Write a protein that binds this DNA or RNA. Sequence first.
RNA 1: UGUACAACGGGGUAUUGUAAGCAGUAGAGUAGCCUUGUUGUUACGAUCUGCUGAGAUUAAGCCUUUGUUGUCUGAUUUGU
RNA 2: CAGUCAAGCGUUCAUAGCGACAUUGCUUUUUGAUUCUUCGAUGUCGGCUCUUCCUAUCAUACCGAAGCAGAAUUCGGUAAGCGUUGGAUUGUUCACCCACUAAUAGGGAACGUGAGCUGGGUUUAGACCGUCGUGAGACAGGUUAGUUUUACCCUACUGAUGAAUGUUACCGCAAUAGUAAUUGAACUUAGUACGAGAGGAACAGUUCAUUCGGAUAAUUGGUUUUUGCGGCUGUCUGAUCAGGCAUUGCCGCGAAGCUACCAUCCGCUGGAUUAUGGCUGAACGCCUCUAAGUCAGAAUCCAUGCUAGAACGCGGUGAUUUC
RNA 3: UCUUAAGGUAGCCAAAUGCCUCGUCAUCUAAUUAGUGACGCGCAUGAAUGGAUUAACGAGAUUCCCACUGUCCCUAUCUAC
RNA 4: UGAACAGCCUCUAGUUGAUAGAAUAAUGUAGAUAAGGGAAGUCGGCAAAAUAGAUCCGUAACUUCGGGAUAAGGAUUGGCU
Lengths: 386, 136, 65
Amino acid sequence: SHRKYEAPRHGHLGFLPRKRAASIRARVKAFPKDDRSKPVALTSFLGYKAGMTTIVRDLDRPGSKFHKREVVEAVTVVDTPPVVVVGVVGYVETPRGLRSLTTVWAEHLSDEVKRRFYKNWYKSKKKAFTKYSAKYAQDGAGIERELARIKKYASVVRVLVHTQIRKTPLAQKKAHLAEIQLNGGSISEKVDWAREHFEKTVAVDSVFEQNEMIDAIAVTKGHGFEGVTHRWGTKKLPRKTHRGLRKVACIGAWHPAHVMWSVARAGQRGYHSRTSINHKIYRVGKGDDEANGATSFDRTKKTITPMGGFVHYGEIKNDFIMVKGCIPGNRKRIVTLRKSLYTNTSRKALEEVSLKWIDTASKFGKGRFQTPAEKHAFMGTLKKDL
Amino acid sequence: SGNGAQGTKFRISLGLPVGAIMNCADNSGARNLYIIAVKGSGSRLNRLPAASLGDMVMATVKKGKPELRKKVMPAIVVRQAKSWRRRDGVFLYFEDNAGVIANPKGEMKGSAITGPVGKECADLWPRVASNSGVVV
Amino acid sequence: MKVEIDSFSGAKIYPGRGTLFVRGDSKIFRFQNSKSASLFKQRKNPRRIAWTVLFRKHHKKGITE
RNA sequence: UGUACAACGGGGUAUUGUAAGCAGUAGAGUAGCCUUGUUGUUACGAUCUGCUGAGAUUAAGCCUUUGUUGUCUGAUUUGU
RNA sequence: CAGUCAAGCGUUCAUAGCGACAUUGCUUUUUGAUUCUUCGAUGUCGGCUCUUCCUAUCAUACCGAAGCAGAAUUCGGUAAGCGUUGGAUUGUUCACCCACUAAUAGGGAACGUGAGCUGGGUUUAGACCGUCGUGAGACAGGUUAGUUUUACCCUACUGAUGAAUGUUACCGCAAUAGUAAUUGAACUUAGUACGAGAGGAACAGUUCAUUCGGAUAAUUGGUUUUUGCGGCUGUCUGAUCAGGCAUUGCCGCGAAGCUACCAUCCGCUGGAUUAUGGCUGAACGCCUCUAAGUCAGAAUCCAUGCUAGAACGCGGUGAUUUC
RNA sequence: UCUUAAGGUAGCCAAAUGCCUCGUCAUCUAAUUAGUGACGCGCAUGAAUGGAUUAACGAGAUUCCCACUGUCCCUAUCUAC
RNA sequence: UGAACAGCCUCUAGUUGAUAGAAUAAUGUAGAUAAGGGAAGUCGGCAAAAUAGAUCCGUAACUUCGGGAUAAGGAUUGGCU
């Protein structure tokens, strides 16, 4: 017979299979549609999600119940030390897809990106790119003609960029590498621009702007094998159920005599690639800049790093992106930041945001102070403060 | 939002599901009101309709004045015990959940409101705002 | 914006950190944390809790400033 | 054989809520003695006060270390 | 359940909406008819959970018709994309009220679903009543109590590895498969259009919300074996200190981690079309959206985007073993 | 008036006995095939094939109310095995 | 300790036997806690929770006068002198 009362499907089907991601750095499937007009600029950036923190700002949308009144919002702060361009790959269009016909590398690749090619760096003899850097001699007799070949046959060119993993407070040293599509000039300008930037750095303030509508692409938090009740949110069976209740009861009718693919089943949860779009940048800070933890209203000399440092992460000592709302992936994790794939002329996106205050209090419990200076002021001297 | 309400009520966390009994903050003689539905509610396979601050509900007077007893009557939630977050960031809650009898258009049956009234409820419903002693 | 003062422990309440409590007699109490927000409902005395600001003021402790 | 890594120690951030010890013109008092006080004196006496936001714990998936002490070639397999 | 005709109904009028007398069908969603399958056993009603499918469409998208002034409504088309509830009583399917809602449409999958549950009903043996029986006993009559067994096999499904393609590492492409967003309210338009008045919209804009979904733990709440701190009982270590035991002794607080529409954020825009409305224009010197040609257009379809990446699809690049 | 051996008396009831039947009325509830109180031409109640009450008692059955709670809304966490 | 050959800890005595090691996924079995609501779940409050010892105050209907009754419902509770 029919289902007695209708109900929505438990869980979205567009994300199957809920298997572990291929790699810890979720790929960027799609890029903003290319132009040949605007200046050459990167379409993405690699960062490391340090954590979250609280903000207060004047909501500035007309017709709100809270127009021109304080709103408390959650933001995630992304550590973004300047990436280094180390290579350029050109793509040709084929009736079977885009095919990379050439990658061209720089001269002195960093040791931290050289570690990427190795699994056992400690005992390896570090011969990577030795003969490429040797080939780079005679003012690059092969490299020059190979760039010309890209210019001759390339429809889309992407630069290879890697993060300065050593600048972050992580225990890792094997830098992550990624392909970033270059939007901007025609192919020749892009590769000339990229050639100018070989083994040269790009920071966020040059690629992302305040109030820009960006996407975070990353691998979600993992949770190991997970039962259906949490994996799909299915109803728990009643308490008096024999042989357990954290299940789904009927996995399918007698016919078809097969468990249908669309039936909730227990297994891996998390660690999937997820793209979260339309996030708002609130502040593209500068690591060199002290007091980036303050605003035009607060005027304190505290940095963005919360007291006691971010939990599990450390401190922010580089440029950062302070973006409203959650992002996929947990702390320490590589995240990919990507420009929006369409013009977002919604009023909510065009809001001209300016912050008022930034929470520096400790994330490691219920800390009540914004800076050790203020904390000292409240409590006075201590038996330790001699 | 109720029909006589002045439009948009931001989402207060629902803490008074169907079957909850709240105090009667007005002076119509009802002692408590027992929720039988919530106006504007949704639909799900086993989800109860729930009430929040400022929601217009349909309630029954389980205890109190005889002629108010034993019939359905619309009510308006003025106090909630389930803490909820405002836009401005604060988590706040009353220690009593209570409402006031009102007709569907949104004019209170009672004359005055006892105790505080939630700011969202007062802002949403003008009549409760007029009769409210202290609004928070 | 403004920072509140906890109604029980006297700690500074920054935007959103803590809860707000409206008693039946319409007296509002802002708590910096569940610690204050729970010691209050237990009917403990702020003047008797050793780390409370009222206790510190009453016993004059640290008042040598 | 190092902006190396680790085990400890240091600092921060945190959690609880004022350690032990000592001292008191603190203490319902009760027994004992006298020089009968106005801090008399001995024994017992919960609890209070001062040292004392003290003491304890703090990554085990917290942050940072100018300190101490170490550790750093064992196996197997792979060819167009 | 759907048509065919059209006596009459409907102010006038058969066909806006109906539809008698008759009449032609369709479905297996009822009950029957048969006994072909199973009686060396296919677990048998309902509910609970969950997935998918049909369309004879309740709502939503776009439309055509009216005894459509507006408002509300009714009939109909493309349409199953998307949703179709909370409760009282009953084992109930069904039914009947209460209420919310946009709506509370009908159905299938061995009357889906018992090695998924429950065992309320039915359906062993106890027992009671009524009626029928002389009696033993009978009763889809009522009532009460009544063991609901096994998966480690194959497959299916969900997740997880994996030999070889010279080796190994990195960066990629993308065939194919999946797909998601949903609906309402308020302010304004506007007390405007419309109407004599009663009444009373809609297009755009804005702020929100419902259902669903993917993340995250800055904030709040929950959890506490941090057995972290504090406290308390009984006992034990001669007393003190410090502790043991009380299956985690208990209580207060309790970071981290996990987690909650109980917390927060986010959930994309182009084409081609259906219905339909149109154009040009013959067939049929006229006329006609139609035949040739063609324009706009739906919650439709295909893309954009998202997910996995063929482990027998593939690309670019690095380094490739001497004593 | 026909018939029997005599025609269900006192009581009780849609009761564990009432098919129609979810009987009718009242109460309980927002809503009640449930519960209770009445009504009784009662298919098919009824007097030691015992009738009607009945304080107390009941691991009997049933309904409602207060308290209580993860039974549920709506799931989350922790420990041991 | 306590009313107690209840429960918990100890003395004499006796054992330290039950295949172990490493991790801490899902589902379980056993033991808990959950904000707001409080049976809306469900055949049905099934399971759980709440109350609980003692002293004092108060105690209804009905009744076979014996009961109901610990009715219901409140207050107090250590240590030390």
